[PDB]
Amino acid sequence: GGLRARKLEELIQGAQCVHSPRFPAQYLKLRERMQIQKEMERLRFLLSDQSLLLLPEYHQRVEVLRTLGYVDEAGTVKLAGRVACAMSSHELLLTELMFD
Amino acid sequence: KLMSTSNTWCDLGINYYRQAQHLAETGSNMNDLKELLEKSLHCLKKAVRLDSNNHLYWNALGVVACYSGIGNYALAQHCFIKSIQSEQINAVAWTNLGVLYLTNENIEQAHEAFKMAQSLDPSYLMCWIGQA
Amino acid sequence: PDMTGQLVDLPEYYSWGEELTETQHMIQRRIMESVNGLKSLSAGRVVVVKNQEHHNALGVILQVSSNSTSRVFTTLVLCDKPLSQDPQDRGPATAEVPYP
Numbered sequence A: 001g002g003l004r005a006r007k008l009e010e011l012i013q014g015a016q017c018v019h020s021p022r023f024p025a026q027y028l029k030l031r032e033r034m035q036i037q038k039e040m041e042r043l044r045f046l047l048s049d050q051s052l053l054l055l056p057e058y059h060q061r062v063e064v065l066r067t068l069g070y071v072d073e074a075g076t077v078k079l080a081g082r083v084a085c086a087m088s089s090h091e092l093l094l095t096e097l098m099f100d
Numbered sequence B: 001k002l003m004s005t006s007n008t009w010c011d012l013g014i015n016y017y018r019q020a021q022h023l024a025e026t027g028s029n030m031n032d033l034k035e036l037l038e039k040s041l042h043c044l045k046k047a048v049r050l051d052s053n054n055h056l057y058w059n060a061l062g063v064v065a066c067y068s069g070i071g072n073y074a075l076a077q078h079c080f081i082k083s084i085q086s087e088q089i090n091a092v093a094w095t096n097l098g099v100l101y102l103t104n105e106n107i108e109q110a111h112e113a114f115k116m117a118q119s120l121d122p123s124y125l126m127c128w129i130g131q132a
Numbered sequence C: 001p002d003m004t005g006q007l008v009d010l011p012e013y014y015s016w017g018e019e020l021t022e023t024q025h026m027i028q029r030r031i032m033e034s035v036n037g038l039k040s041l042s043a044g045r046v047v048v049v050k051n052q053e054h055h056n057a058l059g060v061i062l063q064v065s066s067n068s069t070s071r072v073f074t075t076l077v078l079c080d081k082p083l084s085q086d087p088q089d090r091g092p093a094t095a096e097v098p099y100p
Helices: A002-013 A023-047 A056-068 A080-085 A090-100 B004-025 B034-050 B055-065 B073-086 B091-103 B108-122 B126-129 C010-032 C035-041
Strands: C045-050 C055-064 C074-075
Touching: A002 C010, A023 C010, A080 A090, A080 B108, B004 B034, B004 B055, B034 B055, B055 B073, B055 B091, B073 B091, B073 C045, B091 B126, B108 B126, C010 C035, C045 C074
Parallel strands: none
Antiparallel strands: C045 C055, C055 C074
């Protein structure tokens, strides 16, 4: 971080906008738009699907299904999957035992 | 005559198909049932064009198209594919494609169609018979 | 806006300005958050005070409060002698752009 600070100081000491005639106004407008855009981005993330805490675990579960023969690519149930659907408990182990 | 709807058109086509099938199966004639088959195709095509978003009409046209007297397999394959696309949950259409592939010496691809079809409906009889 | 020319680095400079500040604050946390900083903070210490009250005025700490949980530093800080008695002269001004 300190090295990044040093490099940022080095870059800050050479800006061309500081010498531009229209430095303050355009800059404040840029501040407003970036702040608002960032707030929108966070808002959309809260409104998106990645906000769900358990989504990576859902993906991991579908992958575990796909390595065995229960779900086709793009999520269509296979015969073993529909067999393990109507099962009381330990669906995976019992249906795997049946096919083996 | 007094109420022109699509379902009656499709049923009329199926009835003409049955009459032709009966005449052929008793060896009673051949090449004298041609008009009956063309009438059947005409009725099914009229029904399909009347409402071309129904898997039933595409499926019926496909099955008739592959009758031994007509023997137009490309149209049958097209009709079954259209029926499958129209409504994806269709074991009947998949099994009919499986039969089409199986009779024309395509064991692998017919196996693919039958296995997927029973994947969609585990208690359909014809898919199991095809697998056997 | 149009940034072609003297304004080319105006947004990127801005980014360099923003990120840098968080780093000082991170550094600033790593200043107050450290046990050794918490030990150095005592009498005989000169500090730079930055808030709405003191804007980078140099101050010298007189004492550190005994409750090191709520660390209240009684500190002598220089400010302009108030040549006024009325809070009405303070009003919103141009948003201070970060210069080099």
